[PDB]
Amino acid sequence: PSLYRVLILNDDYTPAEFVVYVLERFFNKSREDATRIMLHVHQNGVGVCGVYTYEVAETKVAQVIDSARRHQHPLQCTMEKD
Amino acid sequence: PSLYRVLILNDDYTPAEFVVYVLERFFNKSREDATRIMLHVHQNGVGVCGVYTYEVAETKVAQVIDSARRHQHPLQCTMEKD
Ligand SMILES: [Mg+2]
């Protein structure tokens, strides 16, 4: 079964603390891991949030976009085969 | 040790035609394949260019950044464990 990684992209608008919040809320990240991934996205432009089956990855991507827009942030989230 | 995927990230400055050029030249993509990946960059924010050993991935990333900046484009190219 081929799994899929969920990615978040950097942007200049979305607050760092919201990205940490998203990682903790939707990707079961510890505070430390969420902070490191957020910083990785900031530094490298993209970061890996988790790995799931195709349909679950689709769900996570959707949940992040929904949350982000309702929080008034343009945060971009997508997926790739892992 | 894993192989490593080379990624190109979207930005609001780099011409589509230059992204296609980079994919053709540095990642040996056919015109259609280069176009396909470029459109993924545009719509999803990131596209996969190729998968290589670590040192070769580093080389590709470097060659893309070198080419991009000399052509006055801010195109970001990075790598992740595949
Ligand atoms: Mg893999």
Curated annotation (Swiss-Prot), chains A, B:
Could you provide one GO biological process annotation from this protein's UniProt record? Answer: proteolysis
Q: Which domain of life is it from?
A: Bacteria
Q: How does it assemble?
A: Binds to the N-terminal domain of the chaperone ClpA.
What is the protein's known function? Involved in the modulation of the specificity of the ClpAP-mediated ATP-dependent protein degradation.
The family this protein is said to belong to? Belongs to the ClpS family.
The name this protein goes by in its record: ATP-dependent Clp protease adapter protein ClpS
